[PDB]
Amino acid sequence: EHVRRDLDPNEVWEIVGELGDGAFGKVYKAKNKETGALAAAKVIETEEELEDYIVEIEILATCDHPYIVKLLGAYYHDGLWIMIEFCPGGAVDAIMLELDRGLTEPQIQVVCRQMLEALNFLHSKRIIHRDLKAGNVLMTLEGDIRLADFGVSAKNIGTPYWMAPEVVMCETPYDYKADIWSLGITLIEMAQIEPPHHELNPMRVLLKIAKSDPPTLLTPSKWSVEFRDFLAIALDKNPETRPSAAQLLEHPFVSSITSNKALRELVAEAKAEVMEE
Amino acid sequence: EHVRRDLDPNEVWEIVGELGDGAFGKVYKAKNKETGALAAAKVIETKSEEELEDYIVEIEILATCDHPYIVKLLGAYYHDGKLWIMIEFCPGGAVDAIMLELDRGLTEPQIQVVCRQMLEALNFLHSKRIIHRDLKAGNVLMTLEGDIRLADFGVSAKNIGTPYWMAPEVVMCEPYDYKADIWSLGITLIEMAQIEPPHHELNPMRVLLKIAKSDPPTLLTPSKWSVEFRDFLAIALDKNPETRPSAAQLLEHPFVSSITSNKALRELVAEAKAEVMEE
Ligand SMILES: COc1cc2c(Oc3ccc(NC(=O)C4(C(=O)Nc5ccc(F)cc5)CC4)cc3F)ccnc2cc1OCCCN1CCOCC1
Numbered sequence: 001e002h003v004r005r006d007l008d009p010n011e012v013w014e015i016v017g018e019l020g021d022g023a024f025g026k027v028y029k030a031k032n033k034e035t036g037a038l039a040a041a042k043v044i045e046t047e048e049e050l051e052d053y054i055v056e057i058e059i060l061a062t063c064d065h066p067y068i069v070k071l072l073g074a075y076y077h078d079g080l081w082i083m084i085e086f087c088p089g090g091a092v093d094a095i096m097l098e099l100d101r102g103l104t105e106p107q108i109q110v111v112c113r114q115m116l117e118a119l120n121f122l123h124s125k126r127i128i129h130r131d132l133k134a135g136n137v138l139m140t141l142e143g144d145i146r147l148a149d150f151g152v153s154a155k156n157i158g159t160p161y162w163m164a165p166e167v168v169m170c171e172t173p174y175d176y177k178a179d180i181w182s183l184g185i186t187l188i189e190m191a192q193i194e195p196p197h198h199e200l201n202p203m204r205v206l207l208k209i210a211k212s213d214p215p216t217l218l219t220p221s222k223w224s225v226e227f228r229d230f231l232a233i234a235l236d237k238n239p240e241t242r243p244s245a246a247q248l249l250e251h252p253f254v255s256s257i258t259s260n261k262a263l264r265e266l267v268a269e270a271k272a273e274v275m276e277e
Numbered sequence: 278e279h280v281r282r283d284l285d286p287n288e289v290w291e292i293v294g295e296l297g298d299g300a301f302g303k304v305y306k307a308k309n310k311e312t313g314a315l316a317a318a319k320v321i322e323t324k325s326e327e328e329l330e331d332y333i334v335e336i337e338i339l340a341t342c343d344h345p346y347i348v349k350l351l352g353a354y355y356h357d358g359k360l361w362i363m364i365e366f367c368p369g370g371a372v373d374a375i376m377l378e379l380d381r382g383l384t385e386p387q388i389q390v391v392c393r394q395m396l397e398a399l400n401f402l403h404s405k406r407i408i409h410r411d412l413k414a415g416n417v418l419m420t421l422e423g424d425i426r427l428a429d430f431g432v433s434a435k436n437i438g439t440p441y442w443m444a445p446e447v448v449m450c451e452p453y454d455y456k457a458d459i460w461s462l463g464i465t466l467i468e469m470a471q472i473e474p475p476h477h478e479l480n481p482m483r484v485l486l487k488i489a490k491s492d493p494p495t496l497l498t499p500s501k502w503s504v505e506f507r508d509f510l511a512i513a514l515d516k517n518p519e520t521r522p523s524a525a526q527l528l529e530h531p532f533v534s535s536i537t538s539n540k541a542l543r544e545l546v547a548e549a550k551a552e553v554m555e556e
């Protein structure tokens with residue numbers, strides 16, 4: 001593996017805080033002793049699990065894109081550290097909570113447009129995410145999005161005649177359509193704070209999703225028709241018919257976006273509310 | 278038994294023949310130097326370290342599958358970079374090899390015996406949360422007495438993100454997954470009836486799309502076969518996993534519920550044994 005394995009982290013970085021006590025684990029905010037560059041340290045306690053994590057770092061090492069979090073280093077000492085470029089805005093779900101309101105349609109358009117640039121880049125590299133949500137999209141001071149994982153997702157027998165129908169569908173081109181659906185749900189999440197069927201517990205929602213009709217926004221007046229159309233085309237149960245990331249890029253909902261000013265305003269607004277006391 | 282890794286197998290067994298040069302590898306016929314109980318030796322040269330680790334887990338799965346209709350594991354050794362698997366010798370051989378040597382398919386009484394014993398085998402595995410996933414005539418061995426011994430040759434197995442942001446297709450893909458073997462079982466009966474599996478004229482790449490797009494297949498010439506035969510195939514070949522019947526349920530079906538004798542299979546083994554002596 002490429003991971004630097006001969007340095008104890010204390011020389012390079014010093015822990016300075018905790019950003020969230022969370023299910024994924026503890027993640028600290030650190031500054032480099034030499035250059036003082038801000039970053040986030042993901043500290044994990046493991047086995048073969050370490051070998052499972054090693055592929056995760058290599059996936060991110062090759063995902064060099066403006067709208068994807070930048071990895072600065074990885075070290076393994078004192079029984080594995082991950083350094084990620086510090087995004088001062090934080091996750092969008094944390095921002096929505098701090099401001100106690102949903103995103104505006106202009107702000108959603110910017111987020112939607114930048115995520116499709118990220119997904120089109122990932123899918124072209126035969127990489128799926130499978131965990132798209134507001135919590136996985138961080139914000140910078142400049143108003144840009146940096147996509148993140150916060151886990152161990154992101155992927156990438158028998159004889160043919162005697163196989164079953166379910167086996168051909170589940171096992172083996174058109175497997176990228178899952179992220180497109182998750183993106184459509186995230187837009188509704190950022191608009192209405194909570195995702196569809198949030199009253200239910202995780203076990204029941206799975207059955208609830210399959211039988212039910214595709215979800216739509218609650219207040220159809222407030223949002224544009226192109227928003228509703230973009231959601232309707234994105235939220236399609238049939239994978240074969242589901243449009244790719246490239247097709248949605250040429251859609252009026254995001255095709256005419258040239259400025260990130262709307263998102264830049266949000267980060268400054270959320271930054272100010274934090275100081276209130 | 279646990280795989281011996283410091284004892285050479287040559288001391289224990291002596292090779293006396295080759296049974297098949299195959300995709301899996303070389304398979305020899307062996308005799309125990311002490312007792313001479315006869316066995317089959319599957320010898321594999323593991324390419325990597327994780328290749329070996331996958332195979333040793335497979336052996337441990339078979340070590341716990343103690344059932345009359347499943348091949349018995351006798352020993353496992355790893356010396357000189359090769360992996361040895363010791364299995365009880367089945368004189369009948371695989372039924373697909375039998376069909377070729379006899380140049381004909383099995384009869385409905387012979388299929389009923391095979392079907393009943395396989396339904397007993399699958400019910401035993403599924404109760405232990407084990408799927409097979411590679412059911413075919415080549416994986417069904419035969420004994421002198423007329424009994425079935427199920428085998429793998431390949432590999433079976435014993436047994437993410439947030440749901441709200443999930444799609445419909447992931448919900449289907451991601452404890453009612455045991456029905457796959459039932460489908461492979463229904464196809465194997467057609468194979469033993471018609472020698473060749475369904476859609477054998479097509480190339481292997483095309484078969485995957487044909488299985489899904491087409492409706493479930495049925496037998497070609499039903500005149501020889503019963504409606505009870507046709508119904509059992511039709512009920513087994515159901516696309517929906519939730520609706521597919523389990524192994525215990527198919528046992529309570531007249532096609533195999535009224536079987537008390539394995540004489541039909543015993544006749545098949547004796548016929549094939551005699552044909553070998555010819556030329
Ligand atoms: C929780 O708050 C924060 C978390 C941060 C952060 O977290 C991580 C994100 C992803 C990974 N991923 C990884 O380590 C990996 C990954 O994500 N791979 C990956 C895979 C596919 C892909 F498309 C993109 C990335 C697994 C490797 C690791 C992280 F540590 C990274 C960078 N800056 C952060 C800033 C945060 O708050 C700043 C604001 C704080 N204030 C807000 C206001 O109130 C007060 C607090």
Ligand SMILES: COc1cc2c(Oc3ccc(NC(=O)C4(C(=O)Nc5ccc(F)cc5)CC4)cc3F)ccnc2cc1OCCCN1CCOCC1
Nearest residue numbers: 296297317319339362365366367368369370427428429430
């Ligand atoms: C090719 O001919 C033969 C092969 C034989 C044989 O092969 C194997 C079967 C399974 C495994 N499985 C394994 O190594 C494993 C397995 O099967 N596990 C498993 C897992 C789950 C399960 F449900 C069942 C089995 C992987 C461990 C390994 C084997 F080596 C086993 C026993 N007797 C055999 C007799 C053969 O011919 C006798 C007749 C010859 N005549 C033919 C006509 O002309 C004259 C000669």
